Amino acid sequence: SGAIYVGNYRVVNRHLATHNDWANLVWEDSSRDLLVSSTTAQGCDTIARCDCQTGVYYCSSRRKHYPVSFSKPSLIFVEASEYYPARYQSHLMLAVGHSEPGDCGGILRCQHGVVGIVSTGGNGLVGFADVRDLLWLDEE
Ligand SMILES: O=C1C=C[C@@H](OC(F)F)C=N1
Ligand SMILES: [Zn+2]
């Protein structure tokens, strides 16, 4: 589990969105595994605006933050998980690291701020849904 809180937006894995998220929907994209809902209180997070390929992510299944190198966001085939069938997921970054389903929502951060959230795992990789292209998160 986990979210990004930027301005009056809450960014979650689409597959973990709640009824309240869907009832306060701003934007969602199944292909990206992302959903954004509106918040009453302003959030503590700054979104990275950059093309970094190195950062640190939080792994809840290890209670640990790991430094990683990661691929640039791309359209990637993802094997079946507990929460999606095998499918193509867009805007996905991969790193070598540990990820189980419940690790989804852990933040990946670089020197510029929040890069994305854990969205995929298995076979020794961790996949992160990028948010750095979502410039509208920074305003309004
Ligand atoms: O509705 C879902 C939830 C999990 C899933 O995975 C599959 F392989 F079980 C697929 N779709
Ligand atoms: Zn960066």
Curated annotation (Swiss-Prot):
| Residues at the active site | 15, 33, 104
Q: Which residues bind Zn(2+) 1?
A: 50, 52, 110, 112
Enumerate the catalysed reactions.
Selective cleavage of Tyr-|-Gly bond in the picornavirus polyprotein
- Top-rank taxon of the source lineage equals Viruses
The free-text function statement in the UniProt record for this protein reads:
Cysteine protease that cleaves viral polyprotein and specific host proteins. It is responsible for the autocatalytic cleavage between the P1 and P2 regions, which is the first cleavage occurring in the polyprotein. Also cleaves the host translation initiation factor EIF4G1, in order to shut down the capped cellular mRNA translation. Inhibits the host nucleus-cytoplasm protein and RNA trafficking by cleaving host members of the nuclear pores. Counteracts stress granule formation probably by antagonizing its assembly or promoting its dissassembly.
Q: How does it assemble?
A: Homodimer.
Give the protein name, as stated in the record.
Protease 2A
Source organism per UniProt = Coxsackievirus A16 (strain G-10)
Which part of the complete sequence is present?
869 to 1008 of 2193
